[PDB]
Amino acid sequence: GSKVTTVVATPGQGPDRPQEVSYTDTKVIGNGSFGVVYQAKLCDSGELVAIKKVLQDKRFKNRELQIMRKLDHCNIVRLRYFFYSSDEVYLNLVLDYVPETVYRVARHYSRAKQTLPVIYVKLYMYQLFRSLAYIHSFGICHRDIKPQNLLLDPDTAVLKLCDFGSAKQLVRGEPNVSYICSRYYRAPELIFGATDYTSSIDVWSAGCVLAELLLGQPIFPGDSGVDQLVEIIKVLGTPTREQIREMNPNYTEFKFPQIKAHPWTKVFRPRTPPEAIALCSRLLEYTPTARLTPLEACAHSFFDELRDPNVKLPNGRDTPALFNFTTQELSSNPPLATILIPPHARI
Amino acid sequence: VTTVVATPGQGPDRPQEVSYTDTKVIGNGSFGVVYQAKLCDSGELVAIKKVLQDKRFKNRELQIMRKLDHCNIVRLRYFFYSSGEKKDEVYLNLVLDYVPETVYRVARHYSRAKQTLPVIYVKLYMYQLFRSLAYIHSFGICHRDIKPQNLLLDPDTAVLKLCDFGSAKQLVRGEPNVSYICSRYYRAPELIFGATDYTSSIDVWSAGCVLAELLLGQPIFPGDSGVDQLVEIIKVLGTPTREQIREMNPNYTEFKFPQIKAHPWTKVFRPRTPPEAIALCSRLLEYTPTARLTPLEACAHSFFDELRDPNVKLPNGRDTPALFNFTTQELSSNPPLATILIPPHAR
């Protein structure tokens, strides 16, 4: 016996039928914007879990819970239970624990002046791209894709997207706030104030992450709000008439300095695989509608290695789930199935 | 000892030799790097701000730094240019008065000791700040980065001086400008909303935030993320009205805000907080750009009247710093107020 907390918590799936859930071994993981996350152990199953404790304010719409219950995908963190706690009201999401973040694993390689082996980039990025495909097919936008919100198991190579405190259904016509993502991963439309944006802000953030896994540092590290547009334009180059028109037409007579775009191949370190570069170029676009959809990205030639039936993880294990698509996932573009699920993986 | 070739800030536009010594770093940031040195010539302590600039971009810091002379603004003594690594870039070395402390440092000191700053010094510091804004807004210029980190001050004489003109730029009616601009705690709401047509009213908002934070003992609008800014504001100002929204940005006209009722101003600060100060913030931290006072209007306010009292003295028994020596320029904003701002006491 040790200190066991017992609470009455409602399943994440299912209809509001609470049950008693005991857990033990509570440790704090971290602390921030997201609230507080504890690690704990389910007494029942022995399994490890993250408990995310958000302070909530009834005055405001707090759509995290609604969305967490809505969804179920191997590349997204699972809500097991949730429950309420006591100065005011606290939401307690009980989620899948996962041992590491991309941020940290990347930071490790960075501190070792070592490039993360591409096979992991391909694994990690692919899986992110499925998690978006999925949330986006409900027209939900995460609006905080960054490395800290990408969890991974290093041994199993499984990635899981997390933190839906800023996620939200985006509806055509409705305007929404444009101070959203983290700075480095904030897409340029949002920096221009645009309220007419789409899902494809998350594809920009994804490209920023890919780039960062190939460089071993962030591709656009703005010193300050303003440096961010600088550090972007220094590589993307100055935008067309119609790129500005396509991000936010208020800037149509802004007069940016004229910078020639730094071609992609000279952005990346010299032994970098083309298809990495190629993909990267089709995510980090000014015109948002020019950026790949998440499913188009999964089908890119940069992930071909993963559809090889012989492929394995470096530690000798099998690759995780990569081809167990549902019709939800493929709604955006169902014929891609033929490329996405290779024959050996087909039922 | 190092000796470089450099150019007097005020005049004349002509290189001369300048020897300084005992360099030591003071800190790094978006601002570049600052060092302390002593001029070998006249013995003096000096701040050497060294930024890296990309010659393809309008780097308007030095022109602005040259057309300023004012007691509550850092004096630019000399400037020079060291060479950069890439051919597109270069080092600008502003050489300014060394002021020995900063407001961010002195509030974070008085707030470690779990208490408020002597209300005299809130009075003194905001006055001298609001003064320099008056001076610079008069030439069209907007600082665009008003925060306690950028307010140097001498603790003995209480002389405060505005600094870092890296984001500073002359606004000009009709032109569009980049919304994503100030430091985050102090970003005026219209900017959060994406307004490309903001005025120098933003710097007043920002000064409003600093007023708060000296009387609150810590920041008044601390977003733990970008989205939480507009939240932590609405939590104090309550929901904006269709008129207030329309004043900030036409596009959020249709945006479904939470209906939140304002938090009474006396109820925001400590119960023993002077109500003149409270009236002041009420008028500085208004959603609507125009409804915010000007800096000149702010200097001439009940809260600062204590400074005009002939019998006022610094609680270290010293005389005050030179609060009343206004120019014609400083007053252009609205010269009637000279009736209030300069008392009988001087003249």
Ligand SMILES: Cc1c[nH]c(-c2cnc(NCCNc3ccc(C#N)cn3)nc2-c2ccc(Cl)cc2Cl)n1
């Ligand atoms: C200050 C700080 C900020 N970020 C972290 C941090 C550090 N290490 C790890 N390791 C993975 C631990 N397992 C976890 C963690 C969270 C979830 C879930 N939902 C599932 N599993 N995770 C995080 C982390 C990552 C995302 C969030 Cl929303 C919160 C945290 Cl604390 N610390």
Ligand SMILES: Cc1c[nH]c(-c2cnc(NCCNc3ccc(C#N)cn3)nc2-c2ccc(Cl)cc2Cl)n1
């Ligand atoms: C990391 C960090 C961030 N801010 C600081 C910091 C700490 N201590 C002090 N003390 C005042 C020293 N004298 C000075 C300093 C600067 C100037 C001028 N222009 C004139 N005089 N100043 C700063 C500071 C404040 C504004 C700027 Cl732009 C730069 C710095 Cl380093 N350190």
Ligand SMILES: [Mg+2]
């Ligand atoms: Mg930079």
Ligand SMILES: [Mg+2]
């Ligand atoms: Mg908060």
